[PDB]
Design a protein around this nucleic acid. Structure first.
Lengths: 32, 125, 220
RNA sequence: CCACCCGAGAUUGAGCUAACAGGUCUGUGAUGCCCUGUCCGGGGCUGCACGCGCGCUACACUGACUGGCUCAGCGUGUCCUACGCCGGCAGGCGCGGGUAACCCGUUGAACCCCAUUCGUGAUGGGGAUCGGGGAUUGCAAUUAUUCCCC
């Protein structure tokens, strides 16, 4: 394929994997 | 069980994920039958019409498409769906159906499974 | 007299402020007065924006010589100012965490349960994926905290290691080369100093391990 | 690279500093030749009967207008810009990010696609040339800098 198009394909497939895996405040205190 | 394939055109890329399902086709989260240019609608719909809706009745696919223009995106999508079905019937279904289906696609159109390696030429000083 | 010396840190002139800061650091490192200055720093942060970095520099230079409850309260206030999105306060307080965990404090200053709690609390930020100024500090302070936790209680540290190793492996997908080298160096340091000498104690691990051997299998 | 075994020899003798077409620097020839401008203000830099050529926009119906829908890449950036408010528009104010695969930016581009108006009409094609006003960059826009509205 070549560098640029394969790079776009790889990142696109990675984003599709993450959106398949997808389907609160920070811990402000140390002790409960 | 699921597979993930890709198809391409000049710059347009389509990544297709193929999972066990019931026969709903998603491209960019949108259904197959609503992609903007209707004049190329059958160009989007050729694998289903050649193979029949009964071969798609036990599977679902989602395609993310990036790059290119309208027509290049359509061609990358149809390459992606054809390669996704070929990969699925190769990996989790018996090989004879995969070979006969691959023969049907390649006798109708080579670009359904083989990428067209044409791109814009560069201009040199 | 200590309060009078301490009150001139927030004085806006750099020559007055730097002299007061260095004097307080020399007095504490040369302690019954640690509680008072820790409470003063906590109240000075809670009152306030450019002086925040100043008593954060105080906290960076003075965290190891503090009692455990005051360390806990200081870290709670520090995560409270981590709720803000300001960058300089984040970098300076990560430097404060680096100075806190780098000195390897004793059990009186820092306990193992407190270290585990602050390790679990620090997982919530991980700036995005590719920021490379705060992610470096975040990896470094988590490395030092894990080293200190293993030094205090080794089995709990090895138990908490697989999550950090998984996040480091995920962070190895960043396009920056420096964060990749830093993650490799950090995991190498943890493997050499915190994982290797305890393997005679752990013994052989199979697919059905239970204790720290299962954690070793998980980070493998 | 070091040391050592074997081996006659794991290095014993001869010949070769040099070079400046890159030059530089206050010197040497009563050295050959040829002679005895600066700052300042204003204007013009194609002003246009014409000849010879590059280009841009069109002569419309495979089109113009209005709305809707939906897709790039090479680059560049302490001037690129996100966002909030005001104005109908150019534009104005404030507040953030970016010395950068981190922010503009998932670069929501145009042709294209889908509906409306138009109907062979120098006409809703085509925009030149003008009249009025606003805004912006500059010390300064007059002989129209550039943009916007009618």
């Amino acid at each position: 394929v070549g560098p640029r198009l394969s790079r776009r394909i790889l990142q696109q497939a990675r984003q599709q994997q993450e959106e398949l895996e997808a389907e609160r405040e920070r811990t402000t205190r140390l002790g409960p | 069980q699921s597979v993930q394939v890709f198809g391409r055109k000049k710059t347009a890329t389509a990544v297709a994920h193929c999972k066990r399902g019931n026969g709903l086709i998603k491209v960019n989260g949108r259904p197959l039958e609503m992609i903007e240019p209707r004049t190329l609608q059958y160009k989007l719909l050729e694998p289903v019409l050649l193979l029949g809706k009964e071969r798609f009745a036990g599977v679902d696919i989602r395609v993310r498409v990036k790059g290119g223009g309208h027509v290049a995106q359509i061609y990358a999508i149809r390459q992606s769906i054809s390669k996704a079905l070929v990969a699925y019937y190769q990996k989790y279904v018996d090989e004879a159906s995969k070979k006969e289906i691959k023969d049907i696609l390649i006798q109708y159109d080579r670009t359904l499974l083989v990428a067209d390696p044409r791109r814009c030429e560069s201009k040199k000083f | 007299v200590y309060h009078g010396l301490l009150s001139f840190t927030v004085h806006p002139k750099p020559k007055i402020r730097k002299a007061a800061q260095h004097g307080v650091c020399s007095v504490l490192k040369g302690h019954p007065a640690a509680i008072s200055t820790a409470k003063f720093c906590i109240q000075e942060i809670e009152k306030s924006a450019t002086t925040t970095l100043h008593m954060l520099t105080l906290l960076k230079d003075l965290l190891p010589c503090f009692p455990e409850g005051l360390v806990k309260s200081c870290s709670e206030t520090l995560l409270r100012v981590m709720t803000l999105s300001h960058v300089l306060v984040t970098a300076c307080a990560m430097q404060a965490f680096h100075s806190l965990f780098h000195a390897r404090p004793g059990l009186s200053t820092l306990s193992a349960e407190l270290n585990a709690q602050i390790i679990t609390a620090l997982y919530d930020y991980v700036p995005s994926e590719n920021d490379l100024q705060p992610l470096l500090a975040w990896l470094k302070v988590m490395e030092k905290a894990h080293i200190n936790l293993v030094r205090l209680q080794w089995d709990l540290g090895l138990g908490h290691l697989p999550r950090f190793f998984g996040t480091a492996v995920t962070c190895l997908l960043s396009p920056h080369s420096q964060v990749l080298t830093a993650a490799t160096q950090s995991l190498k340091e943890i493997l050499k100093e915190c994982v290797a000498p305890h393997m005679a104690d752990i013994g052989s691990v199979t697919s059905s391990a239970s204790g720290p051997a299962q954690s070793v299998a998980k980070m493998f």
